[PDB]
Design a protein around this nucleic acid. Structure first.
Ligand code: MG
Ligand code: MG
Ligand code: MG
Ligand code: MG
Ligand code: MG
Ligand code: MG
Ligand code: MG
Ligand code: MG
Ligand code: MG
Ligand code: MG
Ligand code: MG
Ligand code: MG
Ligand code: MG
Ligand code: MG
Ligand code: MG
Ligand code: MG
Ligand code: MG
Ligand code: MG
Ligand code: MG
Lengths: 105, 96, 206, 150
RNA sequence: AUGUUU
RNA sequence: UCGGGCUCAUAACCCGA
RNA sequence: GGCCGCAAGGUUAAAACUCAAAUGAAUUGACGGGGGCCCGCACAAGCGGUGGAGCAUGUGGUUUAAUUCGAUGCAACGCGAAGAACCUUACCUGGUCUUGACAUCCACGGAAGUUUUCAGAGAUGAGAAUGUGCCUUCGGGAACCGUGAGACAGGUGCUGCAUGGCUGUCGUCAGCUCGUGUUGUGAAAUGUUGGGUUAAGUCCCGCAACGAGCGCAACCCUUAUCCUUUGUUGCCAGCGGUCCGGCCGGGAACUCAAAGGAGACUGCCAGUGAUAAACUGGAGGAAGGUGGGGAUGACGUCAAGUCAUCAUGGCCCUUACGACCAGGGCUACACACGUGCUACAAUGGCGCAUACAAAGAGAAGCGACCUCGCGAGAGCAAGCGGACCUCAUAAAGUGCGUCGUAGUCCGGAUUGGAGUCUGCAACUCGACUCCAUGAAGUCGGAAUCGCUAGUAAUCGUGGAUCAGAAUGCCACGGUGAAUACGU
């Protein structure tokens, strides 16, 4: 982006540019962040259980959809649904946009 | 090494800087066909503890009578050890 | 010996010599002694002077020298007194009227031998090698260092069995030619033995 | 071990043109004196001329045909016992095997010069006789007598 | 087969 | 019995006399 | 002991004495004649060796007055020793000394010294003359010589299990870890495991892991190219000159030299492959897939080696384990082993003539030239401190005379007589030459080693150490293979 990749022949770029490639994808929502959460909301609660392992420790509010095989323990904010349902996948997900910006201002 | 030995050798050195320093030939010319007597060659009892072939080297730094280097004066241990630091101009580890 | 001398194979690049001049089978011989002789007497006295290195050159029938001391002041004394006195030592131990001078060494806590001779004395000074080398030695790190370390020897403390302590910070890749690291040693004769020191001070790569 | 190679060929016949022939000059060559090898592998055919007649080119390979094997065995250990399982050798090493065993006997003739000590075996093949040709069928002995294997 | 030695 | 080899080394085993 | 049984035995069931444990589950590593997977001249495929023979060299043993000491499976055994006649040199027999051979220092006398005399094996001892330095507010002092006296000095004496420093070793192996988080009571685990892939903990993918440090991959060297510049001692193409000799001028074109660069990077093409990495072919190029060879040797293990290089804790010797000299020994031998050299021969030997390299060496040095000598070499003496001269006259190879498979036209040990030289000095113990003598040996058992390419193999050349004794070590090039399915 900035005038820095101009160094090293037309090839090196790919090396450092590839590094970011993954970084961004993995560290998607955090770029702005620089401290800690406040109330994480995961999607596939059960499956993404390991993603809550850290939550249960601190105590950060946890909300997520739990199917019939989910683990209603880690999540301190019960809310079933379906980790599937190609159509209902965003349903409850949309009711979040409101709570956020379109609910705080 | 051994100071007692080092010194014992030092003697074997000064003597050359005396007898051999010049008188070495004062009899030499009278030794090879240059007629020519034998008296001098007979009463030849001046160079005893003195001989241009009885002086050893010993690592200048230390005093090891082995593993000496003319271009230097020390033995493998010191030389290498020193060269490592750089007490020798232009002596990088060779590697063709 | 697993690791060789990180300073040996460095006289070529990223690391200067210590006696740059010229000499053949004839002079090189007597010359090798000279550079030695001086550094011997000079050090003994320049001990408390905090030395880092002693460069030696030779323009013609005389040596140059460059006492790399972290505090040449002591080397001066009554202003010229001390220096002058020693300035004669060389002219006599060199065989020819040689010049002289110095170049103080700032940031001495980031110099091999300096730091080495530093931690080696603390011993006789009754100190805890560990608590010392992991502190009153690693200080170089504080100075925005890139990497450093020290590897003691055996007979550490009142032990009857030789050993070696670790403790290190940063990175000291004594394999990278460009890397460049400051190496030195000091056989601090311990009250009950003779421990050694090995300071690895890497200040930037190439 | 885990890598594979091709072959190490070199400058063929000095004039008669024949890559493989070089081997007969190399395999026989000793002390790295190929300069002399050409002095033996060439002068050899120059002597078999009157001996045989037809192009020395064929002359060689001709009798050579009665020296090259076509089936050998390789020791293979199994459950303690090491069988001598047979195996038909391809042409590549086949022709080679011959040359080796061929040049060998030639140097065991124990007469005078090699030029002749070489021609003898070069022709002894067709007419059948000598140490060289011996090995040829001699190898066949171990062969099949172990067919109970491969 | 053993090693403080089939 | 001895001399040599085999083994980390013995015995055993192999070679020689 | 009681009871049961035909019996074999069953059932009930102690004590003395002895130990500090015995034991269960699980963790880390290690190992297995457990499994899976994968590499390295490990084997397999080839070539050439060792043990055979003689000799050289080291070693064990043995011997001796001493045969100085250390080195011991690989990882000791042409190793410390790149150089033992004296010297070295530590060992021995004898001669001799006792603040010393080497230091500082106090005091006394004397500048230091010089050349000689005698006697001794010398170590010395006692002399004979001569030499008369620096300053002095004159005593004194600076060096230094001898002696006196001690504090001290000296010790290659012992502990490499007291140690530093250094090194070998697996191993140029790809490994070894750590911080944070997390799992477990814990020991620990994870990462680092796994799927591909690589020479590789190499790279990618995945994953309760996230990252990082040491290490492999780079920068250093060097070689393979091309350019730049510099052209002398190096170069010699077009020009002429020429005693026809790069010999003259001359020319800077060429090789060459040598400082700075150009270059190779899965960089590009195709296929395969997860459209991942990567792999397999291609082009272009001197050079392809870490180009080849160096150097570089992780955390560590073998209380691995070295107090004998030197340093050093302790310990020990103190008219001595200190010190000086002469002779002897380390160069023994009734044996055994390791590393080597030369042959057993015609892909050879000897006589002729002949064809061509690379890298280094050097003023107490390399030493041309010419003379004499069969010869080593000796005499004379220039040149070069060196792309200027000397070492330097490469050897295999090549074309001829030949000899004919003989123990010889092979091979060279051994020995006798005569000499050269390096050196005070070569009996003990030196290298070479001359003539005479000509060994064993005809290709080497059990077994065992090296080597994947300019390698192996063979042939020469130079260096180091060094007065003078390389079959060793280090390095250089000439020529110049076989073979590799496969684990
Ligand atoms: Mg001493
Ligand atoms: Mg000598
Ligand atoms: Mg038993
Ligand atoms: Mg027993
Ligand atoms: Mg158990
Ligand atoms: Mg290999
Ligand atoms: Mg094999
Ligand atoms: Mg064989
Ligand atoms: Mg001696
Ligand atoms: Mg003392
Ligand atoms: Mg040890
Ligand atoms: Mg030992
Ligand atoms: Mg022990
Ligand atoms: Mg890595
Ligand atoms: Mg590397
Ligand atoms: Mg001592
Ligand atoms: Mg010896
Ligand atoms: Mg020489
Ligand atoms: Mg020599």
């Amino acid at each position: 982006q900035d005038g820095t990749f101009d160094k090293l022949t037309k090839k090196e770029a790919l090396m450092r540019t590839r590094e970011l490639e993954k970084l961004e994808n993995s560290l998607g929502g955090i770029k702005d962040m620089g401290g800690l959460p406040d109330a994480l909301f995961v999607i596939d609660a059960d499956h993404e259980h390991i993603a809550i392992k850290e939550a249960n420790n601190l105590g950060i509010p946890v909300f997520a959809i739990v199917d019939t095989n989910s683990d209603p323990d880690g999540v301190d904010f019960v809310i079933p649904g379906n980790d599937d349902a190609i159509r209902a996948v965003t349903l409850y997900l949309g009711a979040v946009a409101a709570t956020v910006r379109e609910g705080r201002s | 090494a051994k100071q007692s030995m080092k010194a014992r050798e030092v003697k074997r050195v000064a003597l050359a800087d005396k007898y051999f320093a010049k008188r070495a030939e004062l009899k030499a010319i009278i030794s090879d066909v240059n007629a020519r007597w034998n008296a001098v060659l007979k009463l030849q009892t001046l160079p005893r503890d003195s001989s241009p072939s009885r002086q050893r080297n010993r690592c200048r730094q230390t005093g090891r009578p082995h593993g000496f280097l003319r271009k230097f004066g020390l033995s493998r241990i010191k030389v290498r050890e020193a060269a490592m630091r750089g007490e020798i101009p232009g002596l990088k580890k060779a590697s063709w | 010996g697993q690791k060789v001398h990180p300073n040996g194979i460095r006289l070529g690049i990223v690391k200067p010599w210590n006696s740059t001049w010229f000499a053949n089978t004839k002079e090189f011989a007597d010359n090798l002694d000279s550079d030695f002789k001086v550094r011997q007497y000079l050090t003994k006295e320049l001990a408390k002077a905090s030395v880092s290195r002693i460069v030696i050159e030779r323009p013609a029938k005389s040596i140059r020298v460059t006492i790399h001391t972290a505090r040449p002041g002591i080397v001066i004394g009554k202003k010229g007194e001390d220096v002058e006195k020693l300035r004669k030592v060389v002219a006599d131990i060199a065989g020819v009227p040689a010049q002289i001078n110095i170049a103080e060494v700032r940031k001495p806590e980031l110099d091999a031998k300096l730091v080495a001779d530093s931690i080696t004395s603390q011993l006789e000074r009754r100190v805890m090698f560990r608590r010392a080398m992991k502190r009153a030695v690693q200080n170089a790190m504080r100075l925005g260092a890139k990497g450093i370390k020290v590897e003691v020897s055996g007979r550490l403390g009142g032990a009857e069995i030789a050993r070696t302590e670790w403790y290190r910070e940063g990175r000291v890749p004594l394999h990278t030619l460009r890397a460049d690291i400051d190496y030195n040693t000091s056989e601090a004769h311990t009250t009950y033995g003779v421990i050694g020191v090995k300071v690895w001070i890497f200040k930037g790569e190439i | 071990r885990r890598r594979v190679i091709g072959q190490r060929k070199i400058l063929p016949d000095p004039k008669f043109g024949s890559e493989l022939l070089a081997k007969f000059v190399n395999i026989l060559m000793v002390d790295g004196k190929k300069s002399t090898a050409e002095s033996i592998v060439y002068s050899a055919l120059e002597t078999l001329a009157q001996r045989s007649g037809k192009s020395e080119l064929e002359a060689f390979e001709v009798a050579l045909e009665n020296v090259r094997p076509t089936v050998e065995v390789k020791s293979r250990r199994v459950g303690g016992s090491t069988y001598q399982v047979p195996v038909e050798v391809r042409p590549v090493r086949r022709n080679a095997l011959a040359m080796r065993w061929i040049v060998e006997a030639a140097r065991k003739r124990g007469d005078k010069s090699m030029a002749l000590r070489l021609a003898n075996e070069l022709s002894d093949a067709a007419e059948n006789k000598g140490t060289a040709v011996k090995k040829r069928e001699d190898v066949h002995r171990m062969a099949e007598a172990n067919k109970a294997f491969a």
